[PDB]
């Protein structure tokens, strides 16, 4: 039963805060206690402020994220390379983690659309093509819609 | 150089229509010609109508999609098992494909949040934990925010 200074409480509360923070921005709910809720509120509004920092957004938009773990560790090391610490940097790091999540999804989306189109077009070719040809192709669907 | 009835035009136009349709719903732009644009418009509004069919939404929400390819082929076979064809079924199949895309992303999101939290908390533990302890843990961040 350690207090706030214990590493166990630090890792526990850290996970909670981070998850709440990331999930919040990804929704665009994680059960937490009152003081943790107060911190989550401050975090949320700072993330909002950073979302409006337009130079930062363009920078993050441009970094290529096919090896996102390399990117995360390189940015994290660089942010703290001068041997200084403050809470603003920790907040900033959390913000960066949430941006990586969103960046990662965005690279998944086209591949997912491609894979599923693959299934659908394969089914269409082997099972529907004959009937579609009898309609005179997709122009038959124009007729159907009354165009 | 085949017309609308050729299988080549059918597969080409089919991919275009499907991609436009899925991307449209995923955004929530794919270059196409005028008649293909007319079809895309009708498709879009039907998808809208199906999005409001609430029983269908609950049904699709409930199907488990960890093996989404099995699901797609089983639904597709079942939809056409009676040996009948019409354009409404083809539209409906396209709609289902777009719902699979969205369903697939939704199962990716938590795993992605987990992996990235993993990196961040690992970095925090090895590099920031000592300094955070000197602040008296996360309560130090409450102080920082002026709470």
């Amino acid at each position: 039963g350690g207090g706030p200074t214990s590493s166990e409480q630090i890792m526990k509360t850290g996970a909670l805060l981070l998850q709440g923070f990331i999930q919040d921005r990804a929704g665009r709910p994680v059960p937490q206690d009152a003081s943790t809720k107060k911190l989550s509120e401050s975090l949320k509004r700072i993330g909002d402020e950073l979302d409006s920092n337009m130079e930062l957004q363009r920078m993050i938009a441009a970094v290529d994220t096919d090896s996102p773990r390399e990117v995360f560790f390189r940015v994290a090391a660089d942010m703290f390379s001068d041997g200084n610490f403050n809470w603003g940097r920790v907040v900033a790091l959390f913000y960066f983690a949430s941006k990586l999540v969103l960046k990662a999804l965005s690279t998944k989306v086209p591949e997912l659309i491609r894979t599923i189109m693959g299934w659908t077009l394969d089914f269409l070719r082997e099972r529907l093509l004959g009937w579609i040809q009898d309609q005179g192709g997709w122009d038959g669907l124009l007729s159907y819609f009354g165009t | 150089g085949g017309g609308p009835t050729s299988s080549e035009q059918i597969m080409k136009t089919g991919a275009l229509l499907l991609q436009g349709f899925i991307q449209d719903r995923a955004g929530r732009p794919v270059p196409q010609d005028a008649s293909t644009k007319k079809l895309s418009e009708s498709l879009k509004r039907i998808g809208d109508e199906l999005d409001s069919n609430m029983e269908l939404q609950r049904m699709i929400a409930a199907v488990d999609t960890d093996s989404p390819r099995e699901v797609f082929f089983r639904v597709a076979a079942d939809m056409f098992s009676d040996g009948n064809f019409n354009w409404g079924r083809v539209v409906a199949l396209f709609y289902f494909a777009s719902k699979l895309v969205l369903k697939a992303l939704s199962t990716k999101v938590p795993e992605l949040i987990r992996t990235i939290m993993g990196w961040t908390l690992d970095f925090l533990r090895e590099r920031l934990l000592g300094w955070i302890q000197d602040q008296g843990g996360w309560d130090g961040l409450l102080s920082y925010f002026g709470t």
């Binding site: 700072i46 930062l56 940015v75 809470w87 | -």
Partner: peptide
């Protein structure tokens, strides 16, 4: 590439700077 390494370094520097200047407000922020 070396052009990506510049962007990454840029991101890190901007984030460190953002963090360092959050001190200058009550409540902290931009």
């Amino acid at each position: 590439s070396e052009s990506q390494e510049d962007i990454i370094r840029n991101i890190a520097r901007h984030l460190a700077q953002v963090g360092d200047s959050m001190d200058r407000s009550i409540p902290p922020g931009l």
